[PDB]
Design a protein around this ligand. Sequence first.
Ligand SMILES: O=C(NC[C@@H]1CCCO1)N1CCOCC1
Ligand SMILES: [Cl-]
Length: 115
Amino acid sequence: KTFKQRRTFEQRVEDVRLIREQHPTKIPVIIERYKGEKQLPVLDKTKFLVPDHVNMSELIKIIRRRLQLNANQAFFLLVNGHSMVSVSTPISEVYESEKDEDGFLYMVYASQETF
Ligand SMILES: O=C(NC[C@@H]1CCCO1)N1CCOCC1
Ligand SMILES: [Cl-]
């Protein structure tokens, strides 16, 4: 069901190396709905190539637009399992400290801060 379940560590590693080769300016992001989530829709895809200059605040706006949310639906984004310390950090910096050992940056969204 989840990304890590669907692909071998070997397969996730090789895919990241290919994004490096073909999309060198992009951060490879996995974005998944919280397994408990009732309110928000599922995304149309799992794997996102994010321009490495956007900050976390802009990435939240991007996903809220992708989900076509309205102004009073809540949305919380976890990175590498935990809350974002700041939305002003550039995703290139977030990648280097939060990336998985397979080389993806793993995010999860929910309508509650309590996931
Ligand atoms: O996956 C995405 N785009 C892939 C790009 C577009 C052209 C080459 O690959 N995006 C969704 C998340 O926001 C950034 C854009
Ligand atoms: Cl690129």
